[PDB]
Design a protein around this ligand. Structure first.
Ligand SMILES: CCCCCCP(=O)(O)Oc1ccc2ccccc2c1
Ligand SMILES: [Zn+2]
Ligand SMILES: [Zn+2]
Ligand SMILES: [Zn+2]
Ligand SMILES: [Zn+2]
Ligand SMILES: [Zn+2]
Ligand SMILES: [Zn+2]
Lengths: 326, 327
């Protein structure tokens, strides 16, 4: 069974899953301290519920919200939105790229215990347990990021819960992360190397897939094309089209890797961790939001000749195998 | 009136005040996400209540908790401990040295609104309103720190609440905070230059006091050494003696500046933003906690011949003048 913000669900109940999404990109405590940054908590809930309900109408049954403590994960927000939209949400533990001092001063043993608290006991006082561990690196893994990766591996070996990563920007960091994970004895089948659609290097992707890693092509809608005059947009969403991103799904299917592929939008309903009103720029590129994958990518891949069955395998079977604890 | 975590109090209720303290040094959301770091929330509350009751029995009536959002301020913790200890606590807005992205991406105008929300409306959902604005800088003030200082000046000018600031990693640089604050039209009498006991340069402190700034000699018990192993202990407390620090209080008095002096401990009852078990290092060097000022420093100054009336001016009158909102 998989833990969600509404409690445990069976695999059969998971259904069509977007495995890399967020309700709100933020910082720890920030939504509680300054909800009016989002116009109000109530407005952000309403936006999230309308968006998830549109995704649900397009067939989405589950999302995995990969926001960690330091991305401002608010598990009560997740719970409210999950229940109102009636879509399963899996919450996350782990450490993203903006740890505060109380996180970044911690040893590997301490970080392991924090992730275990979140998976085993619950998040804060809520009893809501994490279903995935999210980690991130920049460039070359920093000493602190290596501690986070080792703690993630150890928490996953203890609980069976999977790890999702990424490397900041379009740097291809999977091989360095995979080295660390394997040094801890973590099976590749527990690890998704995320934001892998940021690169065209198919040799890099195929080799990771061939080792049994899951490949997150999780950014598909993010494109700054047409937004060339917005330098903040280009830095966040890149210059590659969504079709270019989507064709990596095809390329990996064609190389025999369909079982290793996880697809998502990396969308959200509010963001405070970047420039002000960035959500508006995002919303203007992808008015579909989280429904982008079912509504637009899926038919795109069918049209390129991929079998509905192979698409169902990527969007249903792969996420269930990935999320079910081992 | 002055806002506290229990509501508004009158000037005459403020009493002997420690103007630079913390209940817990932490990070935003951390005490809620990992209270077992502190052994438990229940354990942190008990320790804080005992420590504030000790300070109270030593004559303390009010503390100012200068912890900002990014220092992990939990106003519900402050309200709980203030009630159980019967010591008023004034809470803070502002930005310390660990702003997360959602803060460090903000403009001066946005930060001004955030500080105004916490002063005028309340902190989080609690209705508890900040009574001071805390800001911090390093080195040569960074561009982001300059934004924070100007937003603080604008929030103070709109509400009358004062500003407490310091320069981390050096023993001067109040001159940087002063130039920026004055460029915004802020009166120096609304500003305390904190951690001023870290320097031995008295001409520097006297020149700020002559301009009307208040001088925080607020780190007095952090002098302590004897721990020559720890890079941690020294890189944070340092190598001087507390007496030498306390003598800066007498030095400013002798220069005619008694009205400009605020004294405190910069203590806390939990700390997660540095090395694990740093709290135990701090408690071993200063087992008096927040009672160190009234139990050690005040009698030391008395024995150096400072009169009662002067010591009451520093500990009672100056903090009430500082904290009372004055536009
Ligand atoms: C800066 C705050 C955004 C919060 C979203 C967290 P994310 O890391 O999963 O989203 C991003 C945000 C920007 C990215 C830029 C290049 C490559 C991948 C990127 C992923
Ligand atoms: Zn990411
Ligand atoms: Zn992502
Ligand atoms: Zn993401
Ligand atoms: Zn300080
Ligand atoms: Zn201080
Ligand atoms: Zn302090």
């Amino acid at each position: 069974r998989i833990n969600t913000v509404r409690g445990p669900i069976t695999i059969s109940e998971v259904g069509f899953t977007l495995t890399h999404e967020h309700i709100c990109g933020s910082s720890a405590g920030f939504l509680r301290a300054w909800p009016e940054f989002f116009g109000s908590r109530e407005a952000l809930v309403e936006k999230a519920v309308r968006g998830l309900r549109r995704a649900r109408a397009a067939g989405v049954r589950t999302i995995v919200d990969v926001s960690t403590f330091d991305l401002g994960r608010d598990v009560r927000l997740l719970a409210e939105v999950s229940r109102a939209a009636d879509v399963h949400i899996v919450a996350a533990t782990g450490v993203w790229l903006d740890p505060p001092l109380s996180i970044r001063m911690r040893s590997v043993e301490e970080l392991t215990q924090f992730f275990l608290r979140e998976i085993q006991y619950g998040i804060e006082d809520t009893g809501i347990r994490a279903g995935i561990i999210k980690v991130a690196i920049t460039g070359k893994v920093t000493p602190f990021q290596e501690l986070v990766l080792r703690a993630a591996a150890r928490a996953s070996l203890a609980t069976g819960v999977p790890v999702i990563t990424h490397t900041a920007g379009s740097q291809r960091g999977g091989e360095q992360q995979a080295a660390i994970f394997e040094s801890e004895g973590l099976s590749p089948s527990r690890v998704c190397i995320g934001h892998s659609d940021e690169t065209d290097d198919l040799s890099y992707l195929t080799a990771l897939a061939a080792r049994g890693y899951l490949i997150g092509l999780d950014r598909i809608p993010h494109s700054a094309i047409g937004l060339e005059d917005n330098a903040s947009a280009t830095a966040f969403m890149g210059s590659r089209s969504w079709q270019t991103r989507a064709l990596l799904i095809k390329a990996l299917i064609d190389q025999g890797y369909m079982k290793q592929i996880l697809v998502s939008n990396d969308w959200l309903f509010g963001i405070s961790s970047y420039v002000t009103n960035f959500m508006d720029v995002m919303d203007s590129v992808n008015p579909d939001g989280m429904a982008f994958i079912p509504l637009r990518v899926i038919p795109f891949l069918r049209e390129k000749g991929i079998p509905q069955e192979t698409l169902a395998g990527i969007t249903v079977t792969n996420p269930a195998r990935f999320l079910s604890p081992t």
